[PDB]
Chains A and B, each alone.
Chain A
Amino acid sequence: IVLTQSPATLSLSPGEDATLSCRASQSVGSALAWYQHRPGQSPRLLIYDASTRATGIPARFSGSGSGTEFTLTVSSLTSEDFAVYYCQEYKNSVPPTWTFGQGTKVEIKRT
């Protein structure tokens, strides 16, 4: 299912809360996940049911959304939260699809 990361590049100061989006072309449900590709590192799973939190993930990574609109809200941006965030649908249709988004990006804003 087409997933659109509207925020894309995001100039935000560290220590602040950052909201994102992942618009689906079709009605998926709760079958959407979120990822974090930190620079110089492998991706990691943050949320796996568009509301939950994966094991080993701090409670500041929270999300919401159950239809075609999805949103990941990360709070108190540390040095490693400035990464590229992907959203993956895993909708239980036949044939099964593993579709990512383009990748929204959170960056440090300056003057």
Chain B
Amino acid sequence: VQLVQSGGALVRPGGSLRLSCAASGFDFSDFEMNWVRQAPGKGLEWISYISKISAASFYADSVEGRFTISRDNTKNLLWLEMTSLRDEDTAVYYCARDLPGYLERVFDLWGQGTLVSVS
């Protein structure tokens, strides 16, 4: 069990960025995926969720209309297509795995982290 992300990148404000999160060691189709955001000195903050299939996709109130979570459960990649990036999105982006059970909406195993910084 392992979630390996794409590494950080520098992007201009108003630009676009595609994060990646390659999972290994388990079945990607059997697990719900998550994106958790940590600004410097602000704490953890959930921003996205996708289900086992793309039947459900949820976003935080601050990220609706801008960000898009997608998954490829045959290539085991989870993306977060980022669009119209403001100056408050300089943060560390974490790729989290949800436990089995749709009621238990916790973040079980996490990724390596990805520092996205805008300028």
Interface residues of A (CB under 8 A from B): 31, 33, 35, 37, 42-45, 48-49, 54, 84, 86, 88, 90, 92, 95-96, 98-103
- Residues on A with C-beta less than 8 A from B106 are 33, 45, 48, 88, 90
- Residues on B with C-beta less than 8 A from A54 are 108
Q: Is the pair A96, B105 in contact by a Cβ cutoff of 8 Å?
A: yes
- Residues on B with C-beta less than 8 A from A84 are 43
Say how far A46's CB is from chain B's closest CB, in angstroms.
10
Q: Is the pair B43, A102 in contact by a Cβ cutoff of 8 Å?
A: yes
Interface residues of B (CB under 8 A from A): 34, 36, 43-46, 49, 58, 60, 94, 99, 103-113
Q: Is the pair B45, A100 in contact by a Cβ cutoff of 8 Å?
A: yes
- Residues on B with C-beta less than 8 A from A92 are 103
Q: A44-B110, A92-B103, A103-B43 are in contact. List 10 more A-B contacts (CB 8 A).
A: A42-B111, A42-B113, A45-B108, A45-B109, A48-B106, A48-B108, A86-B43, A90-B106, A96-B58, A103-B44
A35 CB contact (under 8 Å) in B44, B105, B112 = B44
Q: Is the pair B43, A35 in contact by a Cβ cutoff of 8 Å?
A: no
- Residues on A with C-beta less than 8 A from B108 are 45, 48, 54
CA distance A43 to B37 in the complex (A): 12
Q: Is the pair A98, B105 in contact by a Cβ cutoff of 8 Å?
A: yes
Of chain B, the residue at the smallest CB distance from A5 is B43
Q: Is the pair B107, A42 in contact by a Cβ cutoff of 8 Å?
A: no
B104 CB contact (under 8 Å) in A43, A49, A95, A98 = A49
CA distance A43 to B99 in the complex (A): 15
Of chain A, the residue at the smallest CB distance from B44 is A100
- Residues on A with C-beta less than 8 A from B99 are 48
Of chain B, the residue at the smallest CB distance from A89 is B105
Q: Is the pair A100, B103 in contact by a Cβ cutoff of 8 Å?
A: no
Say how far B69's CB is from chain A's closest CB, in angstroms.
13
Q: Is the pair A43, B105 in contact by a Cβ cutoff of 8 Å?
A: no
- Residues on B with C-beta less than 8 A from A98 are 34, 46, 49, 60, 105
A43 CB contact (under 8 Å) in B49, B60, B110 = B110
- Residues on A with C-beta less than 8 A from B46 are 88, 98-100
- Residues on B with C-beta less than 8 A from A103 are 43-44
